[PDB]
């Protein structure tokens, strides 16, 4: 499509162009307002529920961050600098308050600010048009006072619209506007064009005039609520409410009581729609809201101990603040599944007699009350009480509770997305394997008859040879002779393969517990080779095969290796992953949303897909930019081309076009300047991506007749190439730039003698700003060019090994959990100590004889048989040995004392649970 061509040609970051709201220049006032708004609503707004900070880059912030946010806003909106560029080459302006992730948050809230501004503009135009149309009637007949039903759309309303700081307040303003002017807008449209519900019943009947005689205006009452006292004294009227009602009695409201009912409804609706009242009540709910949960008929039997909603099956007077992590998300999911019903309220339920138990309605009843004993005052007071009662229960309680529930659910989803981002960042932060490279990836299937496939990959991840071991899964210690012979034969075949190929490291898939057996067999073979000194030490690693499985499923693996079986394909993927996790992850996760196939969070499917994908790709962009991308390597190795899209300011389209041009010219990216001279890259995109693209000058060699810049293979930006050359010259203490740079690179030890502080003052003097961080980065790059900042690879620990092989986590495998196990034998030591069982996850359970039954057991043989299935409760877990103590006592299963069941919610309504199952028993 022409859109791709336009993006390719535009001199802007591809993601910036792809943004839904086009990025536009921001004036100084707009930047200041946006920065303050972003800081208030993104960093200075604590969540109502308990959410822990996800910030992991740090190895809260005060008002000082407002300036950093403003600088970031200027960089993106005006200078079109992407977040990675700002975080890597504009640190002096955003750090230390703002990191790359914080800059992403600022960019997102910049979008939110832009949309809020657009809405405010639209509502301002509507308000001005209404102000004019309403003034049209006054213009014709100024003498006639405005009817009680024609409220004044005064500057107070205009300013209230201008003071909106959130969407909720914007909606409050709009609803207030619609309550009074909603009816007349179609006439407004007709008048402007030519020149170029229960409420209306009371309006037509004239009850609005009676509604104005109740004592206070909605704004006055809202002020009274805000200040928590009688700021405005209700004005009393001589005639009784009924006496004034009979005046307004008509066919619509025949009885005075009906007239009063309509007026009360008008008062209640106006109070609910008053924006000041809405803001005050919103704060009250955000301060005193509590959550109550009651299971349905379905959940009373479905929400058992193993259910994720068992903990909060019953909730009573649980403040929303107590909710933590995705607890609200789980509660909402249970309600969506019909297991329970929720309720958000600001008054205690079933806590009668508690000190200060008066509801918010009782508390504010005196804010619209007249303290007199006269009968007329009492009647008006009753009318006021009922009016506010209706306003609150009918409108305010329902709307505010729904708003709070939405906010809590959003917070829970945000926490889940944060957890997913943390997991992806951890996976992508693993550095390439460094032997104490040639990698032999070994994969096997859970079936016994299935073979074991080994794939050998050279340093560049290209498959060179493979080995098939039909009977490698068999045990060399198996009693059967043919099985031992088959295992031995495979052992020698692998021994010769290892001897000849000499792989630097062997990675074994963590398919199941048998992976440990394969690790032992491979380690023993390597031990034999090192024992005879025929081959150097070969690293042996156990690698999770989730990514390898995804690559095996991906049709890309089929295209690359059509003849390679799935097990061999996943073996190749495992070897590539250990070689370079970032490249493997990027290649495996394509544009077809294959990333979501990975298990990031158990509830990752209940969060917004776009938010999760955006966060994950932000992690990919951050890691790709930090590590750097080699264009020549990508060209020679197509599978590594997936990093260019993640490169800052390039995206999939520009990256693909860059490869297209390079392959069309049949040349290499010899220098960064070629991105402009040859590839015709725009200056802004070049600024964004030049420092994140690496060229291996040494690999280029003498074949590149054109001038070769040594700094092109370093993080040093072309804009700071002269600074790097000056740094080298000062380091060598000359009294040429390309000679000094080469010598300092060979012997960078002289860099420490440099006084970069003075050079910083010199740059500031000549108009370059503070560059101490940049100078330090330049010196570090000169000491080591493109030093890998990823965490060094380390073998998985016992906890990780247990999780990878058993596919179990502490949340799902815990003491007291009810499980199912199959007897595999009797533990002996004639004399016996218990029953041995095997779980479906590979964990070997053990049931002591005493725990084998409620009553004394003489011989376990009659109690259990081989292959029989027994329901057991976990007592102890030994992840290191993949063992688990189990008990099958009937009393233990019953768990009358609730000793084994998981902890319940703090506000669990045990009284409600007891009554519910007692009535069920009845």
């Amino acid at each position: 499509t022409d859109q791709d061509n336009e993006i390719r040609a535009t001199d802007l970051p591809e993601r910036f162009q792809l943004r839904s709201i086009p990025v536009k220049g921001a004036e100084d006032d707009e930047l200041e307002e946006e920065a303050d708004w972003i800081y208030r609503n993104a960093f200075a707004t604590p969540t109502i529920s308990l959410q822990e900070s996800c910030d992991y880059l740090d190895r809260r912030k005060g008002p000082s961050t407002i300036q950093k946010i403003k600088e970031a806003l200027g960089f993106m909106r005006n200078q079109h600098f992407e977040v990675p560029f700002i975080a890597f080459y504009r640190k002096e302006y955003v750090e230390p308050e703002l990191h790359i992730n914080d800059l992403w948050r600022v960019w997102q809230w910049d979008e939110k600010w832009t949309q809020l501004r657009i809405r405010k503009e639209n509502l301002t135009r509507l308000f001005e048009k209404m102000q004019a149309y309403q003034y049209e009637q006054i213009s014709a007949d100024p003498d006639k006072p405005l009817a009680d039903g024609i409220r004044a759309l005064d500057t107070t309303d205009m300013e209230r619209l201008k003071d909106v700081q959130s969407m909720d307040e914007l909606k409050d303003v709009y609803n207030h506007f619609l309550l009074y002017y909603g009816r007349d807008i179609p006439k407004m449209q007709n008048a402007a064009k030519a020149s170029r519900d229960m409420y209306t019943i009371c309006q037509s009947a004239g009850l609005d005039g009676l509604a104005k005689k109740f004592g206070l205006t909605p704004e006055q009452f809202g002020e009274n609520l805000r200040d928590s006292y009688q700021r405005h004294e209700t004005e009393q009227f001589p005639a009784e409410p009924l006496e004034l009602a009979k005046d307004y009695v008509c066919s619509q409201f025949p009885t005075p009581e009906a007239v009063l009912e309509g007026a009360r409804y008008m008062v209640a609706l106006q109070i609910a729609r008053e924006p000041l009242v809405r803001q005050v009540l919103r704060q009250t709910f955000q301060e005193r809201a509590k959550l109550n949960i009651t299971p349905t008929k379905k959940g009373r039997k479905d929400v058992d101990e193993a259910h994720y909603a068992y903990s909060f099956k019953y909730l009573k007077n649980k403040p929303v603040k107590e909710l933590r992590d995705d607890q609200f998300l789980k509660i909402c999911l249970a309600e969506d599944e019909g297991l329970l019903t929720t309720d958000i309220s600001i008054d205690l339920k079933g806590v009668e007699g508690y000190g200060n138990d008066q509801t918010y309605f009782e508390e504010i009843k005196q804010f619209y009350y007249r303290d007199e004993f006269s009968h007329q005052v009492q009647e008006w007071n009753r009318q006021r009480t009922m009016a506010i009662e209706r306003a609150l229960q009918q409108f305010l309680y329902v709307q505010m509770a729904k708003e709070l529930k939405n906010k809590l659910l959003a917070e829970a989803k945000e926490y889940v997305i944060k957890a997913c981002s943390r997991k992806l960042y951890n996976w992508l932060r693993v550095a390439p394997y460094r032997p104490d490279i040639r990698v032999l990836g070994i994969a096997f299937s859970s079936a016994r008859d299935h073979p074991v496939f080994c794939a050998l990959v050279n340093g560049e991840g290209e498959v060179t040879d493979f080995l098939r071991l039909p009977h490698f899964t068999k045990r060399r210690t198996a009693w059967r002779e043919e099985e031992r012979e088959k295992k031995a034969q495979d052992i020698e075949t692998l021994k010769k393969f290892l001897l000849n190929k000499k792989p630097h490291v062997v990675t074994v898939a963590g398919e199941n517990r048998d992976a440990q057996m394969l690790i032992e067999d491979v380690k023993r073979i390597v031990h034999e080779l090192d024992q005879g000194q025929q081959l150097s030490s070969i690293g042996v690693e156990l690698v999770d095969n989730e990514l390898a499985i995804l690559y095996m499923n991906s049709k890309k693996s089929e295209a690359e290796f059509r003849d390679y079986p799935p097990v061999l394909r996943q073996a190749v993927s495992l070897a590539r992953r250990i070689q370079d996790p970032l490249i493997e992850f990027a290649q495996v996760c394509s544009s077809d949303e294959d990333i979501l196939c990975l298990k990031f969070h158990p509830l990752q499917e209940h969060v917004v897909k776009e938010e999760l994908l955006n966060a994950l790709y932000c992690e990919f962009i951050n890691r790709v930019n930090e590590v750097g991308v080699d264009v020549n390597r990508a060209i020679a190795h197509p599978y590594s081309q997936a990093l260019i899209q993640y490169v800052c300011g390039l995206g999939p389209r520009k990256g693909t076009h860059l490869l297209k041009i390079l392959k069309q010219n049949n040349t290499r990216l010899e220098s960064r300047t070629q991105l402009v001279t040859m590839c015709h890259m725009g200056p802004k995109v070049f600024m964004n991506c030049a420092g994140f693209l690496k060229i291996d000058t040494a690999s280029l060699g003498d074949s590149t007749d054109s001038y070769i810049e040594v700094l092109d293979g370093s993080r040093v930006h072309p804009e700071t190439y002269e600074w790097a050359r000056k740094m080298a010259v000062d380091a060598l203490e000359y009294d040429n730039p390309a000679g000094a740079l080469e010598e300092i690179l060979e012997n960078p030890e002289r860099l420490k003698d440099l006084d970069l502080d003075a050079f910083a003052e010199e740059l500031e003097r000549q108009g370059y700003g503070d560059k101490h961080i940049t100078l330090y980065d330049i010196r570090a790059e000169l000491s080591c060019r493109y030093k890998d900042l990823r965490t060094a690879y380390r073998s998985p620990n016992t906890e990780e090994i247990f999780n990878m092989l058993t596919k179990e986590t502490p949340e799902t495998f815990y003491i007291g959990k009810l499980i199912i196990c199959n007897v595999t034998g009797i533990a002996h030591r004639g004399q016996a100590i218990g029953v041995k069982t095997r779980l479906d996850n590979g964990v070997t359970g053990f049931i002591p004889t005493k725990f084998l039954s409620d009553k004394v057991v003489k011989r376990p043989e009659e109690r259990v048989k081989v292959g029989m299935t027994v329901h057991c409760r976990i007592m102890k877990i030994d992840i290191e040995k993949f063992s688990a103590d189990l008990t099958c006592r009937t009393s233990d299963l019953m768990d009358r004392n609730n000793e084994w069941k998981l902890p319940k919610d703090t506000y669990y309504d045990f009284d409600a649970e007891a009554a519910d199952h007692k009535q069920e028993e009845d």
Partner: protein, 155 residues
Amino acid sequence: QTVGVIVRLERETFQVLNMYGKVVTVRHQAVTRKKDNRFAVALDSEQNNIHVKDIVKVIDGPHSGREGEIRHLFRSFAFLHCKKLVENGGMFVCKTRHLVLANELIGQTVRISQGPYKGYIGVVKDATESTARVELHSTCQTISVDRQRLTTVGS
């Protein structure tokens, strides 16, 4: 790792329902036919034997109060069928546990060494785990003799 049932048919794309219950689109060539397990075993909450084409109720799991007929079976998953269900073409997937109830002697030559047929010799045409059918070379008749009364005649 994942097996599904085709629930919708289209000119170009396919909407195959996997064990997990979600809907994923694939092409005609990529998807390969898998044989159905006409006889498979599984497990349920009640700890009773469940077979294929058995009416069951989803009292718990992804679906609530749902009735269907099993069409395909997996170790820990099962495919249910219905005609009143608009979603997923009337086909859905639920866990088996969550679901609740709603030869070597053949061809050898044997000598009957005990009983009224002692001394007779025949060829085993079909032998059960306890009894075997011996066609007698002499009497033109096949008889059922307890396998404990047979001894294979070695050459």
